[PDB]
Design a protein around this ligand. Structure first.
Ligand SMILES: O=C1C[C@H](c2ccc(O)cc2)Oc2cc(O)cc(O)c21
Ligand SMILES: O=C1C[C@H](c2ccc(O)cc2)Oc2cc(O)cc(O)c21
Lengths: 240, 240
């Protein structure tokens, strides 16, 4: 049997979306609970996750959870979207959320490492610090060249959690420069938008379409819900 | 030869030591090529690892490999010490470099996540940027508190690649503040050194001792060679 999975989450961040993708790809059974910035004050820092009150957060095991309850002592609390991706691959081995070959598992984890050390820093300096679009586009060149040039997904022919880790990021990057919502340099957003639609990113376009076609994306991507919450998160930042 | 392991390594840096600990714990057959961290052989970048020319770098498969040779095209090349650790737990499932339970595996990964996002940057601010010693001790307090208080290793009663990830940092940090070899603020190295010997850090002294008592330390930790290359690296960097 499958012990109980309750995911604490939100829509603006790419990070809960990563977890949902894997959960869907494993045809897992789970419930979701949403979490606001007022939830993290009133009850989610006091009652559920005191250390850092971050989502995403998996509760594995124990009984049915509703909002404002504390997780049972005996259930496991698992933060950190990448660890959770690894946990799901361990929990659902029949789903091959990671390939079986040790070298191709490394290749998946090297892909993710680079999303984290290279793609995310570039996005931050570009969308949040007004950096120039050259830097952003060169990070995207590099990401694209790490894709298998002979086609398929990040680690090769089979979908893996390396795809779950980057795809939420690319979708929101595209949205944020399509809506021009960000702390961009002047005209930076439409430079990046037009380049992502051009031949320089053919391989990446194809990779995005290959991921968006799988039933797991339709099941985890709600344009409006993400947009709504993405715009909001930008205004929070903006204020302060 | 379908299983040959060649490791590009060095002594001063913690990251190749992580891999050696794992190889010894797995009773793996392997060969080492020594890349100098004081005067890096430029054939390493030109013929072996052009992108980043960093150690550790693990060559899996193919024929015998000598210094000043390119690895075979048909062999796998794996950088990133934490990826290599996971790679070796997958190569050697019977060694149990990770526990079998998914929650305990997540526990190990979480522990490592914390070494990476809290301990290393604290060490960096401290050893490289001359930051105050109490900030460094605070990251050490937190590390110690994440250990099982009764005894045992990072993730439980069994050794795991999470001990392989943190033990080389701990050893070199001790050595570094004991010889005051670093860009420390006046009097900050002795504060940390004396606090590491005091009853505040007794649980952590235990952890280091328990790890050092395992055969894998004697087989991987040559303190005189580490110190020679660590001092030589530091003096070179200072002169610049
Ligand atoms: O999921 C991660 C991310 C974590 C990490 C997080 C932040 C950081 O700066 C570095 C590493 O390292 C790991 C180490 C592992 O053995 C397995 C893992 O799944 C991870
Ligand atoms: O070893 C790592 C570290 C890498 C990482 C590097 C920098 C960073 O900020 C976060 C993660 O992420 C991972 C993700 C995985 O699924 C498995 C892994 O072994 C790793």
């Amino acid at each position: 049997a499958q012990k109980r999975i309750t995911l604490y989450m939100a829509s603006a961040s790419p990070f809960p979306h990563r977890v949902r993708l894997a959960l869907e790809e494993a045809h897992a059974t789970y419930e979701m609970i949403h979490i606001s910035l007022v939830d993290k004050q009133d009850w989610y820092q006091k009652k559920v996750y005191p250390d850092r009150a971050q989502v995403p957060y998996l509760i594995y095991g124990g009984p049915e959870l509703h909002p404002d309850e504390a997780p049972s002592p005996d259930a496991a609390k698992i933060p950190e979207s990448l660890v959770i991706l690894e946990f799901l691959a361990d929990l659902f081995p029949a789903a091959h959320l990671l390939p079986s070959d040790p070298v191709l598992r490394a290749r998946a984890r090297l892909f993710t490492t680079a999303v984290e050390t290279e793609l995310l820093p570039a996005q931050k300096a570009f969308f949040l610090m007004g950096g120039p679009p050259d830097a952003m586009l060169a990070a995207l060149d590099a990401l694209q060249a790490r894709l298998p040039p002979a086609g398929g997904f990040a680690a090769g022919p089979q979908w893996s959690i390396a795809d779950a880790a980057v795809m939420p990021i690319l979708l929101r990057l595209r949205m944020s420069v399509t809506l021009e919502v960000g702390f961009f340099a002047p005209g930076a957003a439409p430079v990046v938008r037009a380049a992502l639609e051009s031949p320089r990113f053919a391989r990446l376009q194809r990779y995005i379409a290959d991921n968006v076609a799988r039933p797991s994306m339709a099941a985890t991507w709600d344009e409006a819900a993400v947009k709504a919450e993405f715009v909001g998160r930008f205004e929070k930042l903006r204020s302060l």
